[PDB]
Write a protein that binds this ligand. Structure first.
Ligand SMILES: *[C@@H]1O[C@H](CO)[C@@H](O)[C@H](O)[C@H]1NC(C)=O
Ligand SMILES: *[C@@H]1O[C@H](CO)[C@@H](O)[C@H](O)[C@H]1NC(C)=O
Ligand SMILES: *[C@@H]1O[C@H](CO)[C@@H](O)[C@H](O)[C@H]1NC(C)=O
Ligand SMILES: *[C@@H]1O[C@H](CO)[C@@H](O)[C@H](O)[C@H]1NC(C)=O
Ligand SMILES: OC[C@H]1O[C@@H](O)[C@H](O)[C@@H](O)[C@H]1O
Ligand SMILES: OC[C@H]1O[C@@H](O)[C@H](O)[C@@H](O)[C@H]1O
Ligand SMILES: [Ca+2]
Ligand SMILES: [Ca+2]
Ligand SMILES: [Ca+2]
Ligand SMILES: [Ca+2]
Ligand SMILES: [Mn+2]
Ligand SMILES: [Mn+2]
Ligand SMILES: [Mn+2]
Ligand SMILES: [Mn+2]
Lengths: 236, 236, 234, 236
């Protein structure tokens, strides 16, 4: 069969095969709250990674892995708007939250440069785009393919629905270097899609960690970043 | 594991686990040509089904199946336009091409009515929309979710690329009755998506056959309908 | 992923993805009764509705496969006939004309004809020398290749009415076919392994399934398979 | 699909999703040498675990997991005999080699008692059975199901073949609490089998680590303990 394949229909408190970084944790109702949700709403940053590294490419054979992932998340804001967003990403094996990272960078970047050493590929679901604080963002809530920088190489308008469950399917096909993001809201049939070319071998190291990250830059514009389930499979 | 799961990376001439109806066949280059391609072009209709029925729902337990399928196809037209389109469908087990069917109906319908007895769910990739002959179609090449009728319940503009390979992922999630179509062109990043609500239990019988169908209504406006690979999985 | 993979936790009456041959059918309790239960002589086979490509003539590749199933053989007296078998045969093959229960509806004779193109793992309950001269002197598990006279057998510690779990694996690279049987009830286990070159015996496209028979109504027993998992890959 | 499923056709030097304990490592030829192989030969103990914990049972729902694993190993001895053996095991998440463990205990036990706190289930392929040093062992090379003690609850004669590759399939079926070990030698058709009843919920904690361990108690009677490939899948 395939190299790796795991599925979580729900999460359990202190799940031992998920590494929790920052304020990420799983509530008693079985949902992964990557971003903290509490009594007085507070600023927050969190990441959750699957406990075992994944070989995304082989230097011996030259082979690159194809992978697919599916997850459902909810972003519920108190007012009609919230910050900062959520992201699915691939980073160097067992990487830590960069020193001096902000919610607007989802705990993935130290700065707004496009440093080659970052070695990060992420699909962001950006809810905040204020030019004052996030000058790199377009003028709307978006879905962006990030490659070594918080300034997405390609974005698309995200028709975010407050409090509604969104189903996402991301697929990467090694032979064509095609990364496709497929988002839909079963509630009303709203759908958004985006595809970009990315050479994993050129950006990432052989061994990577996969997971979710998110942040809340301003407690006044609070919103949740809850992932309900997660399926992942890769194959060299 | 899951109830069923099959994968074809390429096809073989006279593949014994695919039922060929009409002019459908697989070339020596290993591609499923649902529609006939020849020296002097001709009118054509064809369907190809996986040889074994699939239980899409259980009358005993009440359970409904969730399924996902992925395939890549190419539609290459001689001129800058072609007819008639291609479709992925679920029909009653071992059903035959309806008597008196046309290319515009992809060999799935006898008429343009919405008869409940048709028991057909299909995702069409419609290339012809002329009002003279296809009065039910919108004013552009589209992707449509068909339920018991050639007049789609929901469509979306399909940014068809002549001769380019398109990757499609269709998922049906029983719990939310959500059918999502995800199409993308690795060549230039063009992507189209559509989602609709469909209750399989209400439309289809317990046992169904899945496959592709397509047609060429006018030999003068010829185009191919080739599927390169196919992955399918269902689970009750 | 793999070329094919299916799983049946239980069966349904008139399951449309199983081809029923002979007296095979599935009861309302969801069990595949390959052999008729009511009393009478019987022969039956059940195949998965779609052919499977076991090897490619273009590339030369051979498929590795694994299957798991649980069956029960309940006899009225302390003994029964005739046995059950899991097999691979030419695509959509029919029960051979003039076949007997002792041959499980897989063979026309007791010869080793190359044209039979059949590989089967039998769970033989009858071994009387008068009628089954090819069989050893005990209930056995045998690897059959083009003949009812197994190329290799092993004593089968059959337990009347108990559920047996079986796992069969074929690893193409080493041409190794292994049968793993166990009884969760009391821990009884039997195992057997043999070398078989599928490419040499079978055609490219085959049908897989179960077959069984009851040669004498007086020594009745059931041949019920409760579940079935199968997966192959080229 | 299933909760977890991974497959290694070969191993890579310093594989990042395998935790190496003791002298375990993977050679350049891609084989997991759980026990050290060098010239001059030396006493050795080693363990290799999959990097991520696995939930073997849920305290909330009461559910127990069914799992299956397949691997191929080779035990090549210099003389006509070797020590000490190899083992596949399930232990508490991220457990370490017990302080004061010996090769005869495969780096799994501190003593020869049957302490309930050990929380270990292992299938051993014991090559040494000398009564002087291993008084608990039967009078032949064996396969044993160990539950919280090096004194197996059930054994069977193991017809070990020097230097030959052995294929093993272990399955645990939660509903019947049945653990079955299926070993065979493709080389000559030699096969050994053993089955026992084990209630995982009663022995192990919810989260466990799975892997291989082995030892060489006496450098004079050296032998290798190499696993060539490993497939594992579990499901709650
Ligand atoms: C950004 O993060 C990296 C990695 O932790 C660190 O080396 C670098 O110093 C950080 N930048 C700043 C200004 O701290
Ligand atoms: C449409 O197809 C159905 C099924 O083959 C058939 O019964 C019906 O008569 C057809 N309509 C016409 C006009 O033939
Ligand atoms: C044995 O079965 C084959 C296949 O049906 C048939 O051709 C042959 O004639 C049978 N033998 C006899 C004696 O009928
Ligand atoms: C046996 O191992 C356990 C766990 O490391 C340890 O607590 C115990 O002290 C060990 N026994 C001895 C004699 O060291
Ligand atoms: O007595 C038992 C035997 O009865 C015969 O009629 C039959 O051909 C044999 O296969 C076996 O069933
Ligand atoms: O001769 C082999 C034996 O050597 C002993 O020193 C050791 O305690 C035993 O476990 C075994 O390794
Ligand atoms: Ca932002
Ligand atoms: Ca049309
Ligand atoms: Ca017999
Ligand atoms: Ca020992
Ligand atoms: Mn952004
Ligand atoms: Mn249309
Ligand atoms: Mn026999
Ligand atoms: Mn022992």
């Amino acid at each position: 069969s395939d190299d790796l394949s795991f599925n979580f229909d729900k999460f359990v408190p202190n799940q031992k095969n998920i590494i929790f970084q920052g304020d990420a944790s799983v509530s008693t109702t079985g949902v992964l709250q990557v971003t903290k949700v509490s009594k007085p709403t507070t600023t927050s940053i969190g990441r959750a990674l699957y406990a075992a590294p994944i070989q995304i490419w082989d230097s011996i054979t030259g082979k690159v892995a194809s992978f697919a992932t599916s997850f459902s998340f909810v972003v519920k804001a108190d007012k009609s708007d919230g910050v900062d967003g959520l992201a699915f990403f691939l980073a160097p094996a067992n990487s830590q939250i960069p020193s001096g990272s902000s919610a607007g960078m989802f705990g993935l970047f130290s700065s707004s440069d496009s440093k080659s050493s970052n070695q990060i590929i992420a699909v962001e679901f950006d809810t905040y785009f204020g030019k004052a604080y996030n000058p790199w963002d377009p003028d709307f809530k978006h879905i962006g393919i990030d490659v070594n920088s918080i300034k997405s190489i390609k974005t698309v308008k995200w028709d975010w629905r407050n409090g509604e469950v969104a189903d996402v399917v991301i697929t990467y096909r090694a032979p064509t270097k095609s990364l496709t993001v497929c988002l839909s809201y079963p509630s009303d049939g709203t759908s958004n899609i985006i595809t970009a070319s990315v050479d994993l071998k050129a950006i990432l190291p052989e061994w990577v960690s996969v997971g979710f990250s998110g942040g809340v830059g301003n407690a006044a514009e609070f919103e949740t970043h809850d992932v309900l389930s997660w399926y992942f499979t890769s194959n060299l």
